[PDB]
Amino acid sequence: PQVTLWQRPLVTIKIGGQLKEALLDTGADDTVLEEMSLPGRWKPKMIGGIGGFIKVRQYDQILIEICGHKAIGTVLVGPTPVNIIGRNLLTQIGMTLNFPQVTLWQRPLVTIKIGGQLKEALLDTGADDTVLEEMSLPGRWKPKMIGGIGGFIKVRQYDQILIEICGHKAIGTVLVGPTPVNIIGRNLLTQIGCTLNF
Question: How many domains does the chain fold into?
Fold first, then answer.
Protein backbone atom coordinates (compact mmCIF):
# COMPACT_ATOMS: atom_id res chain seq x y z
CA PRO A 1 0.00 0.00 0.00
CA GLN A 2 1.14 3.47 -1.04
CA VAL A 3 -0.63 6.26 0.79
CA THR A 4 -0.74 9.97 0.07
CA LEU A 5 -0.82 12.67 2.68
CA TRP A 6 -3.83 14.76 1.72
CA GLN A 7 -5.51 13.17 4.73
CA ARG A 8 -4.14 11.77 8.04
CA PRO A 9 -2.53 8.38 7.35
CA LEU A 10 -4.81 6.33 9.68
CA VAL A 11 -4.58 2.57 9.88
CA THR A 12 -6.52 -0.18 11.74
CA ILE A 13 -4.53 -2.08 14.38
CA LYS A 14 -5.36 -5.07 16.59
CA ILE A 15 -3.59 -5.08 19.98
CA GLY A 16 -4.55 -7.14 23.04
CA GLY A 17 -7.66 -8.50 21.40
CA GLN A 18 -8.90 -4.95 20.69
CA LEU A 19 -9.41 -3.01 17.43
CA LYS A 20 -8.19 0.62 17.21
CA GLU A 21 -7.21 3.22 14.57
CA ALA A 22 -3.74 4.74 14.75
CA LEU A 23 -1.62 7.31 12.91
CA LEU A 24 1.41 6.30 10.84
CA ASP A 25 3.86 8.80 12.37
CA THR A 26 7.40 9.00 10.91
CA GLY A 27 8.18 11.82 13.31
CA ALA A 28 7.70 9.67 16.45
CA ASP A 29 10.50 7.40 17.66
CA ASP A 30 8.06 5.46 19.88
CA THR A 31 4.58 4.01 19.58
CA VAL A 32 2.15 5.65 21.99
CA LEU A 33 -1.41 4.56 22.52
CA GLU A 34 -4.39 5.93 24.42
CA GLU A 35 -5.16 4.38 27.85
CA MET A 36 -6.20 0.77 27.32
CA SER A 37 -6.28 -2.63 28.96
CA LEU A 38 -3.03 -4.39 28.32
CA PRO A 39 -1.86 -7.55 30.16
CA GLY A 40 1.47 -7.96 31.89
CA ARG A 41 4.16 -6.05 33.73
CA TRP A 42 5.04 -2.51 32.73
CA LYS A 43 7.36 0.27 33.82
CA PRO A 44 6.70 4.02 34.34
CA LYS A 45 8.34 6.21 31.71
CA MET A 46 8.36 9.84 30.66
CA ILE A 47 8.25 11.03 27.06
CA GLY A 48 8.59 14.48 25.63
CA GLY A 49 6.57 16.10 22.86
CA ILE A 50 5.33 19.48 21.72
CA GLY A 51 3.57 20.98 24.70
CA GLY A 52 5.73 19.05 27.16
CA PHE A 53 6.22 15.66 28.78
CA ILE A 54 3.81 12.91 29.76
CA LYS A 55 4.27 9.86 32.01
CA VAL A 56 3.50 6.54 30.33
CA ARG A 57 3.50 2.85 31.24
CA GLN A 58 5.89 0.91 29.09
CA TYR A 59 5.15 -2.63 27.83
CA ASP A 60 7.70 -4.65 25.87
CA GLN A 61 7.07 -7.54 23.49
CA ILE A 62 3.53 -6.53 22.65
CA LEU A 63 2.18 -8.10 19.44
CA ILE A 64 0.42 -5.62 17.17
CA GLU A 65 -1.27 -6.34 13.86
CA ILE A 66 -0.88 -3.08 11.91
CA CYS A 67 -2.96 -3.11 8.78
CA GLY A 68 -2.88 -6.93 8.84
CA HIS A 69 0.92 -7.24 9.24
CA LYS A 70 2.28 -8.61 12.53
CA ALA A 71 4.97 -6.83 14.56
CA ILE A 72 6.27 -7.24 18.17
CA GLY A 73 7.76 -4.41 20.15
CA THR A 74 7.51 -1.87 22.87
CA VAL A 75 4.28 0.07 23.18
CA LEU A 76 3.71 3.05 25.48
CA VAL A 77 0.26 3.58 26.93
CA GLY A 78 -0.73 7.00 28.13
CA PRO A 79 -2.55 10.30 27.76
CA THR A 80 -1.91 10.76 24.01
CA PRO A 81 -4.54 12.74 22.18
CA VAL A 82 -4.07 10.23 19.27
CA ASN A 83 -2.80 6.62 18.89
CA ILE A 84 0.61 6.90 17.19
CA ILE A 85 2.62 4.18 15.51
CA GLY A 86 6.25 5.31 15.72
CA ARG A 87 9.44 4.30 13.93
CA ASN A 88 10.10 1.41 16.28
CA LEU A 89 7.21 -0.45 14.66
CA LEU A 90 7.24 1.22 11.22
CA THR A 91 10.64 -0.28 10.30
CA GLN A 92 9.21 -3.72 11.11
CA ILE A 93 6.34 -3.50 8.61
CA GLY A 94 8.78 -2.18 6.00
CA MET A 95 7.51 1.36 5.76
CA THR A 96 9.51 3.86 3.58
CA LEU A 97 9.08 7.55 2.62
CA ASN A 98 9.30 8.60 -1.05
CA PHE A 99 9.36 12.24 -2.19
CA PRO A 100 14.48 9.82 -2.84
CA GLN A 101 13.25 6.86 -0.83
CA VAL A 102 13.94 6.94 2.89
CA THR A 103 13.78 4.02 5.33
CA LEU A 104 12.92 4.73 8.96
CA TRP A 105 15.80 3.16 10.92
CA GLN A 106 16.98 6.72 11.57
CA ARG A 107 14.92 9.95 12.07
CA PRO A 108 14.02 11.20 8.56
CA LEU A 109 15.86 14.59 8.58
CA VAL A 110 16.23 16.94 5.64
CA THR A 111 17.87 20.34 5.18
CA ILE A 112 15.51 23.21 4.42
CA LYS A 113 16.24 26.82 3.47
CA ILE A 114 13.76 29.33 4.86
CA GLY A 115 14.07 33.07 5.31
CA GLY A 116 17.66 32.95 4.02
CA GLN A 117 18.69 30.50 6.79
CA LEU A 118 19.55 26.81 6.61
CA LYS A 119 18.02 24.39 9.17
CA GLU A 120 17.46 20.64 9.51
CA ALA A 121 13.89 19.43 9.92
CA LEU A 122 11.96 16.20 10.51
CA LEU A 123 9.63 14.78 7.82
CA ASP A 124 6.61 14.24 10.06
CA THR A 125 3.58 12.37 8.67
CA GLY A 126 1.84 12.63 12.03
CA ALA A 127 1.77 16.46 11.98
CA ASP A 128 -0.93 18.40 10.13
CA ASP A 129 1.11 21.60 10.40
CA THR A 130 4.74 22.68 9.98
CA VAL A 131 6.25 24.03 13.19
CA LEU A 132 9.72 25.54 13.55
CA GLU A 133 11.71 26.57 16.60
CA GLU A 134 11.95 30.35 17.19
CA MET A 135 13.68 32.10 14.30
CA SER A 136 13.87 35.41 12.41
CA LEU A 137 11.03 35.50 9.93
CA PRO A 138 9.75 38.71 8.28
CA GLY A 139 6.19 39.89 8.03
CA ARG A 140 2.94 39.94 9.92
CA TRP A 141 1.98 36.82 11.85
CA LYS A 142 -0.99 35.66 13.91
CA PRO A 143 -0.85 33.99 17.34
CA LYS A 144 -2.24 30.42 17.35
CA MET A 145 -2.49 27.55 19.83
CA ILE A 146 -1.52 24.06 18.73
CA GLY A 147 -1.71 20.95 20.81
CA GLY A 148 0.52 17.91 20.97
CA ILE A 149 1.52 15.12 23.29
CA GLY A 150 2.53 17.24 26.23
CA GLY A 151 -0.35 19.66 25.78
CA PHE A 152 -0.52 22.94 23.87
CA ILE A 153 1.77 25.80 22.84
CA LYS A 154 1.22 29.30 21.46
CA VAL A 155 2.93 29.75 18.12
CA ARG A 156 3.19 32.65 15.65
CA GLN A 157 1.53 31.88 12.35
CA TYR A 158 3.16 33.08 9.07
CA ASP A 159 1.39 32.40 5.80
CA GLN A 160 2.73 32.28 2.29
CA ILE A 161 6.26 31.45 3.43
CA LEU A 162 8.71 29.98 0.88
CA ILE A 163 10.57 26.85 1.93
CA GLU A 164 13.10 24.88 -0.05
CA ILE A 165 12.93 21.30 1.30
CA CYS A 166 15.67 19.04 0.05
CA GLY A 167 15.87 21.25 -3.06
CA HIS A 168 12.11 21.44 -3.64
CA LYS A 169 10.33 24.77 -3.38
CA ALA A 170 7.01 24.94 -1.55
CA ILE A 171 4.86 27.82 -0.24
CA GLY A 172 2.68 27.66 2.82
CA THR A 173 1.82 28.41 6.40
CA VAL A 174 4.69 27.99 8.84
CA LEU A 175 4.24 28.03 12.63
CA VAL A 176 7.11 29.39 14.69
CA GLY A 177 7.33 28.63 18.36
CA PRO A 178 8.72 26.47 21.16
CA THR A 179 9.02 23.09 19.42
CA PRO A 180 11.88 20.82 20.51
CA VAL A 181 12.55 19.83 16.84
CA ASN A 182 11.69 21.55 13.57
CA ILE A 183 8.75 19.59 12.08
CA ILE A 184 7.68 19.55 8.39
CA GLY A 185 3.98 18.51 8.42
CA ARG A 186 1.36 17.33 5.94
CA ASN A 187 0.60 20.85 4.72
CA LEU A 188 4.05 20.99 3.05
CA LEU A 189 4.66 17.28 2.53
CA THR A 190 1.84 17.00 0.00
CA GLN A 191 3.55 19.76 -2.01
CA ILE A 192 6.90 17.97 -2.53
CA GLY A 193 4.86 14.88 -3.41
CA CYS A 194 5.63 12.76 -0.34
CA THR A 195 4.13 9.22 -0.24
CA LEU A 196 4.19 6.53 2.42
CA ASN A 197 4.82 2.91 1.27
CA PHE A 198 4.54 -0.39 3.19
Answer: 2
